Amino acid sequence: TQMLTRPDVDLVNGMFYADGGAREAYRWMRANEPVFRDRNGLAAATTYQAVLDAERNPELFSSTGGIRPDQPGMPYMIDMDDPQHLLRRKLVNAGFTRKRVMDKVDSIGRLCDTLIDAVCERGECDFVRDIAAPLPMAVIGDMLGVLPTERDMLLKWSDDLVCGLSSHVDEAAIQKLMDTFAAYTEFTKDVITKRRAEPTDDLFSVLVNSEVEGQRMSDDEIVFETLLILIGGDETTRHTLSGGTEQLLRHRDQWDALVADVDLLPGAIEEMLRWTSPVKNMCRTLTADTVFHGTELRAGEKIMLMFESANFDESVFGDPDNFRIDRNPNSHVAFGFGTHFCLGNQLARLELRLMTERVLRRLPDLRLADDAPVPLRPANFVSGPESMPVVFTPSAPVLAHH
Amino acid sequence: TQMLTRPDVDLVNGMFYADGGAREAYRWMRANEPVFRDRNGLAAATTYQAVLDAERNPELFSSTGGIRPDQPGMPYMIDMDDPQHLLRRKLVNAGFTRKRVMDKVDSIGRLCDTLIDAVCERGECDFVRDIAAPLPMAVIGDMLGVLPTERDMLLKWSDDLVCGLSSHVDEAAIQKLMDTFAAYTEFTKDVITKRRAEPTDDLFSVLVNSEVEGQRMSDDEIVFETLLILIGGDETTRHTLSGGTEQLLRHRDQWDALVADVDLLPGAIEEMLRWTSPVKNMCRTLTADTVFHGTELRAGEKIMLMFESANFDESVFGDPDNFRIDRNPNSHVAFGFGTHFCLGNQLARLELRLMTERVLRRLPDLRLADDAPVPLRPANFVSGPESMPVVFTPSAPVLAHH
Numbered sequence: 048t049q050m051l052t053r054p055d056v057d058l059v060n061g062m063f064y065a066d067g068g069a070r071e072a073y074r075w076m077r078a079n080e081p082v083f084r085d086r087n088g089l090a091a092a093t094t095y096q097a098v099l100d101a102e103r104n105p106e107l108f109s110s111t112g113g114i115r116p117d118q119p120g121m122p123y124m125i126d127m128d129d130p131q132h133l134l135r136r137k138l139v140n141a142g143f144t145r146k147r148v149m150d151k152v153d154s155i156g157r158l159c160d161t162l163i164d165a166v167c168e169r170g171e172c173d174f175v176r177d178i179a180a181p182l183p184m185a186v187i188g189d190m191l192g193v194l195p196t197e198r199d200m201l202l203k204w205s206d207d208l209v210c211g212l213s214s215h216v217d218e219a220a221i222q223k224l225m226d227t228f229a230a231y232t233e234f235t236k237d238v239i240t241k242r243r244a245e246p247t248d249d250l251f252s253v254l255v256n257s258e259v260e261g262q263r264m265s266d267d268e269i270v271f272e273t274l275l276i277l278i279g280g281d282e283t284t285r286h287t288l289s290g291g292t293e294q295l296l297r298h299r300d301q302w303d304a305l306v307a308d309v310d311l312l313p314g315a316i317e318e319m320l321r322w323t324s325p326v327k328n329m330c331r332t333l334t335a336d337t338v339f340h341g342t343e344l345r346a347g348e349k350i351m352l353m354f355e356s357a358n359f360d361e362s363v364f365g366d367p368d369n370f371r372i373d374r375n376p377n378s379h380v381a382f383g384f385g386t387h388f389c390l391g392n393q394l395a396r397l398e399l400r401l402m403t404e405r406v407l408r409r410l411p412d413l414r415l416a417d418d419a420p421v422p423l424r425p426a427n428f429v430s431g432p433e434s435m436p437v438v439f440t441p442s443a444p445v446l447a448h449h
Numbered sequence: 450t451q452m453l454t455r456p457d458v459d460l461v462n463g464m465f466y467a468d469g470g471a472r473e474a475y476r477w478m479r480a481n482e483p484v485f486r487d488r489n490g491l492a493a494a495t496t497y498q499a500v501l502d503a504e505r506n507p508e509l510f511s512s513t514g515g516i517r518p519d520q521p522g523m524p525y526m527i528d529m530d531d532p533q534h535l536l537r538r539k540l541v542n543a544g545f546t547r548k549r550v551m552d553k554v555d556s557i558g559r560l561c562d563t564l565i566d567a568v569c570e571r572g573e574c575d576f577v578r579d580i581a582a583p584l585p586m587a588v589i590g591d592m593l594g595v596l597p598t599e600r601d602m603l604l605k606w607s608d609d610l611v612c613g614l615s616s617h618v619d620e621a622a623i624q625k626l627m628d629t630f631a632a633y634t635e636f637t638k639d640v641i642t643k644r645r646a647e648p649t650d651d652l653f654s655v656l657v658n659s660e661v662e663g664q665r666m667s668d669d670e671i672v673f674e675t676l677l678i679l680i681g682g683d684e685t686t687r688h689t690l691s692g693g694t695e696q697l698l699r700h701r702d703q704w705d706a707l708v709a710d711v712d713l714l715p716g717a718i719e720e721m722l723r724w725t726s727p728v729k730n731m732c733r734t735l736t737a738d739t740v741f742h743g744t745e746l747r748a749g750e751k752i753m754l755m756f757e758s759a760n761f762d763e764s765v766f767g768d769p770d771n772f773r774i775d776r777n778p779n780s781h782v783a784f785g786f787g788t789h790f791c792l793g794n795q796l797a798r799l800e801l802r803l804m805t806e807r808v809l810r811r812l813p814d815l816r817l818a819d820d821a822p823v824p825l826r827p828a829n830f831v832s833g834p835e836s837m838p839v840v841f842t843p844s845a846p847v848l849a850h851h
């Protein structure tokens with residue numbers, strides 16, 4: 048005897064996150080079955096409170112089963128629980144100190160200018176393809192100290208490892224994934240061996256030299272953690288930049304306020320993060336039977352923490368369906384919460400701030416080419432704008448390197 | 450000083466309620482300033498809790514100042530406080546017993562089929578002009594026992610008594626209003642006098658005969674209470690019918706459920722009522738200074754109870770932005786709450802159910818002619834659809850009187 052208006056959905060179907068019906072479905076779930084089971088019985092924590100409770104209780108909600116719903120865990124920190132997680136995190140954190148992040152201000156700002164220079168004379172571009180997508184990848188490659196060509200191979204390997212993991216059933220699809228993993232590891236071990244012998248100041252060198260409680264990372268460990276960073280740092284930042292900007296463009300009074308006053312921008316960045324929630328879910332595995340916010344969960348099953356749904360929880364935000372750059376407080380969970388809280392959160396905030404500040408200054412009349420909805424990427428994990436045609440009065444490039 | 454995102458609105462401007470921006474503005478109010486002051490300082494209770502608290506405390510929130518923001522009270526029951534109100538109400542209640550309402554089932558049903566008969570062969574109509582608008586006026590005229598021609602005159606007097614009250618600054622406009630009030634009173638007293646002499650079973654007869662605690666209504670009182678019913682019973686019922694049906698038409702699985710099963714219709718009517726909230730506000734006058742849900746209010750000022758805002762209060766409804774005929778419970782305040790709780794609520798529910806049942810049965814494939822938003826009537830008091838083109842497979846008229 049299900050209810051007439053119960054959403055009939057498959058939360059691992061990428062279309063659910065792209066076709067525009069997600070927020071409606073979440074409203075139904077938060078109001079009627081806050082820990083919701085989809086058409087395949089898959090459990091999902093949909094309220095902010097259920098998400099936080101699960102985040103604060105990794106003893107009961109484990110990450111070691113893997114954070115995707117139909118794959119096992121990988122050997123990197125997001126698929127580990129404390130105490131192993133904490134040590135691995137503290138090791139890798141050497142690369143993400145406040146000082147290491149803040150010292151990238153010049154280089155990231157310089158990248159931002161070159162990307163804008165590439166479109167500013169034209170008076171139109173695709174914001175995704177031409178500004179949002181290149182930026183996070185270029186920051187990563189510069190962080191790793193690699194060439195742009197190397198950066199391109201790496202970020203494509205890491206794409207293919209993502210695809211082949213989510214789909215490895217045919218014997219050819221298995222061999223292809225194993226080949227990709229071999230080529231990834233071989234390239235990355237080579238770079239590591241080089242950094243051991245002739246240190247630089249890049250992330251590889253930092254991981255090689257990191258030491259916590261007498262322990263250091265092995266080469267295999269750096270290979271996996273580097274992978275996690277290639278995967279975790281790229282598309283998410285892209286989608287906040289593009290989806291976040293999209294909302295600024297649709298709220299002209301807010302856009303104008305930000306053009307007139309750059310001190311409003313940190314608050315805007317937090318609203319962009321909440322609104323876009325690029326990571327749609329992370330899984331946890333039940334370590335015991337428990338009744339959780341009304342739903343009986345069994346040991347061994349996975350539950351999806353639905354961060355977008357949490358970030359639109361009216362019981363916490365009051366008016367989450369209104370986009371507001373002045374929202375304060377804004378305790379959104381776009382980066383999760385708790386021991387796994389996004390390691391790259393400060394760097395992501397920096398990239399968003401440095402690029403948006405320059406978008407505001409250099410393209411001050413920016414608008415959507417047309418007000419229709421922006422297409423989103425059908426994906427069940429990280430999703431945001433596929434393309435976003437924009438227009439602006441052209442201006443002359445800065446061409447900093449001359 | 451004010452927040453960037455604070456709505457800049459005039460709650461007595463009818464365009465606020467028709468241009469589609471109201472629900473967004475209410476979201477901001479409920480979240481940020483539950484007793485909100487508009488751009489002219491006019492106070493408004495926007496949360497369900499603030500509306501219920503005001504309704505339950507008429508000692509502090511009086512109706513005797515008038516229930517409109519810019520007019521004094523009239524001598525009929527909605528502008529009275531208890532004990533005067535209770536007595537007047539109980540007298541008039543003789544016309545609205547369960548028995549009197551239920552004994553209208555055949556006549557209202559017959560009316561409904563006559564209205565559908567006028568469009569069924571054509572395959573299209575304007576649902577406001579041709580179905581929603583005629584019905585509540587015809588029920589009222591039948592209730593009073595008058596001829597259709599008289600009913601038409603009464604309902605036009607009542608309209609422009611409403612218009613002239615709202616605007617009567619200059620001498621010419623004061624004169625038109627006094628002229629209509631005299632013409633209205635003359636006609637109604639004449640009918641009353643006839644009914645005293647030669648009783649029928651209509652509402653005038655029932656009011657003449659009503660006796661509560663040894664007291665009876667005078668002719669002048671029946672004149673005023675009849676005026677209140679002519680105003681109160683007409684456009685409100687229209688807007689729930691047309692706006693309610695509009696939502697059923699836009700949710701095809703719900704429409705299809707109702708066509709298959711008429712037992713879902715009482716729940717549907719309650720959701721139609723909540724969603725459409727045709728009475729957008731009623732005023733109260735403060736009888737003392739008080740700090741109310743955060744806002745300092747002064748004795749003698751008026752506050753608007755924003756019923757639609759209360760009916761979209763997420764803290765109470767969970768998912769009010771999803772239209773759901775299965776919503777249960779559904780304690781909406783479309784009829785208000787408390788001692789003034791709509792006297793016509795059961796007749797209105799009856800008209801809505803009898804007409805909707807016939808629409809479902811006789812026009813089972815009904816649809817909006819196109820999906821664009823339906824124009825709403827700019828008015829600061831009672832508002833809903835101005836027109837609603839619909840289409841359906843034609844059928845043969847019933848032609849009951851043959």
Ligand SMILES: OC[C@H]1O[C@@H]2O[C@H]3[C@H](O)[C@@H](O)[C@@H](O[C@H]4[C@H](O)[C@@H](O)[C@H](O[C@H]5[C@H](O)[C@@H](O)[C@@H](O[C@H]6[C@H](O)[C@@H](O)[C@@H](O[C@H]7[C@H](O)[C@@H](O)[C@@H](O[C@H]8[C@H](O)[C@@H](O)[C@@H](O[C@H]1[C@H](O)[C@@H]2O)O[C@@H]8CO)O[C@@H]7CO)O[C@@H]6CO)O[C@@H]5CO)O[C@@H]4CO)O[C@@H]3CO
Pocket residue numbers: 524627630631634669670672
């Ligand atoms: O229902 C109509 C018939 O009711 C007659 O008796 C009414 C009584 O009049 C009602 O008000 C009700 O209680 C009264 C209460 O006695 C009175 O204090 C109160 O307050 C009003 C105040 O007294 C007025 O001064 C008013 O301001 C008006 C102003 O004073 C005046 O100059 C007016 O212009 C009037 C005009 O002067 C007058 O001629 C009127 O025409 C009316 C007829 O003359 C009149 O006889 C009446 O019919 C009543 C029967 O005769 C019952 O005995 O209605 C005629 C119109 O149909 O024209 C203008 C008014 O039409 O301008 C000011 C307003 O125009 O201020 C207070 C109101 O704002 O009034 C209450 C009622 O509100 O007792 C009976 C029951 O209804």
Ligand SMILES: OC[C@H]1O[C@H]2O[C@H]3[C@H](O)[C@@H](O)[C@@H](O[C@H]4[C@H](O)[C@@H](O)[C@@H](O[C@H]5[C@H](O)[C@@H](O)[C@@H](O[C@H]6[C@H](O)[C@@H](O)[C@@H](O[C@H]7[C@H](O)[C@@H](O)[C@@H](O[C@H]8[C@H](O)[C@@H](O)[C@H](O[C@H]1[C@H](O)[C@H]2O)O[C@@H]8CO)O[C@@H]7CO)O[C@@H]6CO)O[C@@H]5CO)O[C@@H]4CO)O[C@@H]3CO
Pocket residue numbers: 122225228229232267268270271
């Ligand atoms: O899923 C784990 C599970 O794997 C099962 O299925 C695999 C099969 O085992 C494997 O052969 C695969 O095909 C691989 C091939 O045969 C390998 O030769 C490989 O080439 C390897 C090279 O052979 C190795 O040198 C290897 O280097 C690794 C290094 O020595 C070591 O430090 C390691 O780092 C990981 C740890 O070693 C390790 O503990 C690991 O945890 C694993 C456990 O040790 C396993 O017992 C557990 O069971 C195995 C089954 O026995 C096996 O049949 O699986 C655990 C999962 O991790 O994680 C550590 C992370 O730091 O790994 C170093 C490399 O980074 O790697 C090279 C890469 O070319 O090529 C194939 C894999 O690409 O066949 C099936 C699947 O088809």
Ligand code: HEM
Pocket residue numbers: 102124125126136275276279280281283284287324325326329354380381382383384385386387388389390391392394395
């Ligand atoms: C807007 C951009 C980003 C978003 C929305 C985002 C979001 C998240 C989320 C939701 C988690 C899981 C936290 C949890 O389950 O509670 C996570 C973890 C993680 N992220 Fe990010 N991320 C972003 C950018 C980045 C960047 C730039 C990097 C690195 C360069 C990065 C690296 C990591 C790593 C290493 C983890 C694992 C931390 C752990 O398990 O302790 N992320 N992120």
Ligand code: HEM
Pocket residue numbers: 504526527528538677678679681682683685686689726727728731756782783784785786787788789790791792793794796797
């Ligand atoms: C959908 C149809 C209707 C709606 C939405 C509606 C709404 C309301 C509202 C909101 C109030 C004020 C309650 C308050 O302030 O707390 C009210 C009062 C009143 N209504 Fe209705 N109404 C409707 C239909 C009718 C009908 C058919 C009649 C019969 C003519 C009627 C007669 C009255 C009367 C006489 C009052 C004053 C009762 C009092 O002050 O005690 N209404 N209505």
